[PDB]
Design an enzyme around this catalytic site. Structure first.
Site, PDB file in Angstrom:
ATOM      1  CG  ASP A 181     -26.452  15.570  -3.893  1.00 31.35           C
ATOM      2  OD1 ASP A 181     -27.299  15.769  -4.785  1.00 31.35           O
ATOM      3  OD2 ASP A 181     -25.338  15.016  -4.152  1.00 31.35           O
ATOM      4  CB  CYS A 215     -38.836  13.332  -5.175  1.00 29.38           C
ATOM      5  SG  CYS A 215     -39.882  12.593  -3.820  1.00 29.38           S
ATOM      6  NE  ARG A 221     -35.077  16.042  -2.612  1.00 31.47           N
ATOM      7  CZ  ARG A 221     -33.989  15.826  -3.346  1.00 31.47           C
ATOM      8  NH1 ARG A 221     -34.034  15.976  -4.658  1.00 31.47           N
ATOM      9  NH2 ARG A 221     -32.865  15.421  -2.762  1.00 31.47           N
ATOM     10  CB  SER A 222     -43.455  14.032  -3.923  1.00 33.13           C
ATOM     11  OG  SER A 222     -42.651  13.745  -5.077  1.00 33.13           O
ATOM     12  CD  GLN A 262     -38.365  10.522   2.160  1.00 27.22           C
ATOM     13  OE1 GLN A 262     -37.940  11.410   1.412  1.00 27.22           O
ATOM     14  NE2 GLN A 262     -37.985   9.271   2.055  1.00 27.22           N
TER      15      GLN A 262
END
Ligand SMILES: O=C1O[C@H]2CN[C@@H]3CC[C@H]([C@H]2C3)N1Cc1ccccc1
Length: 282
Positions: A181, A215, A221-222, A262
């Site tokens: 998370d 994502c 994440r992508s 990110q």
């Protein structure tokens, strides 16, 4: 510089935030006018994550052709990817329309439906064989064929039917279920094992349309997934694998979608994944 020793040099000097901010400063800025039209407000999950006009995927519809999705075309590596946000309640039919029209074999999902107690994307695929889904706005039917649950990821076989023509296709759903998370994984081993399973399925190969990867926003994440895949492929193709420059590859990918990677922690994790992956390939 090479990668593994550039890596230790940034760790010892603690300069990951400065490296990442340089990337943000040098990244391309292209218009995203279609994304910002008022009629598309409920088609975007986040107001600050939009596809560029020049690389956006168009739906084959005359009313409204807009989806929050981008084509990342890597010329030297000879790989293409579609990166998209997690589907919204009012875009699940558009999502599967795109999969159909672009001739994709595989969908790669890097988030859970709920994270941090909030919804990160719609439940856009069926959970039981006998309870199929019909998307009336785009005239598609989606059936769960089989499901294989493993410790770090799940693979599903799905049948997508175009109800207008009665044509059917088999789609593979690759769901990485254990990204934490908060932060990034401690080791890249399970993420790399997952990447290799996607590769082995054919979903990334030229005989199919581009893989669809998402994502929640379709950039963090992508971005880590496609950056690691492309860097490892280039290390196999070139005479000198130490010439592969992960920062330059990331800036190339950011010509096609904003914001890929990110955080500085995601940047460090991408380096780690490529470094460990290059040892297993040989
Ligand atoms: O790091 C790895 O962990 C291995 C478990 N064993 C398999 C062989 C390839 C392996 C993974 C699958 N790699 C390297 C790799 C991963 C992704 C793409 C390109 C190379």
């Amino acid at each position: 510089m090479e990668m593994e020793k550039e890596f230790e040099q940034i760790d010892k000097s603690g300069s990951w935030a400065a490296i990442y901010q340089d990337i943000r400063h040098e990244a391309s800025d292209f218009p995203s006018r279609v994304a910002k039209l008022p009629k598309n407000k409920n088609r975007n999950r986040y107001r600050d994550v939009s596809p560029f006009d020049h690389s956006r995927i168009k739906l084959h519809q005359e009313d409204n052709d807009y989806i929050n999705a981008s084509l990342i075309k890597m010329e030297e590596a000879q790989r293409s990817y579609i990166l998209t946000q997690g589907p919204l309640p009012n875009t699940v039919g558009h999502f599967w329309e795109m999969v159909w029209e672009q001739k994709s074999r595989g969908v790669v999902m890097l988030n859970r439906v709920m994270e941090k107690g909030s919804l990160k994307c719609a439940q856009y695929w069926p959970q039981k064989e006998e309870k199929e889904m019909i998307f009336e706005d785009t005239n598609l039917k989606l059936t769960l064929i089989s499901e294989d649950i493993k410790s770090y990821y799940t693979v599903r076989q799905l049948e997508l039917e175009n109800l207008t023509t009665q044509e059917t296709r088999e789609i593979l759903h690759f769901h990485y279920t254990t990204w934490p998370d908060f932060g990034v994984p401690e080791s890249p081993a399970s993420f790399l094992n997952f990447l290799f399973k996607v590769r082995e399925s054919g979903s990334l190969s030229p005989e199919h349309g581009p893989v669809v990867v998402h994502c929640s926003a379709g950039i963090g994440r992508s971005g880590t997934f496609c950056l690691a895949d492309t860097c490892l492929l280039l290390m196999d193709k070139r005479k000198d694998p130490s010439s592969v420059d992960i920062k330059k590859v990331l800036l190339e990918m950011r010509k096609f979608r904003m914001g890929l990677i990110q955080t500085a922690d995601q940047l460090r994790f991408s380096y780690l994944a490529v470094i460990e992956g290059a040892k297993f390939i040989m």
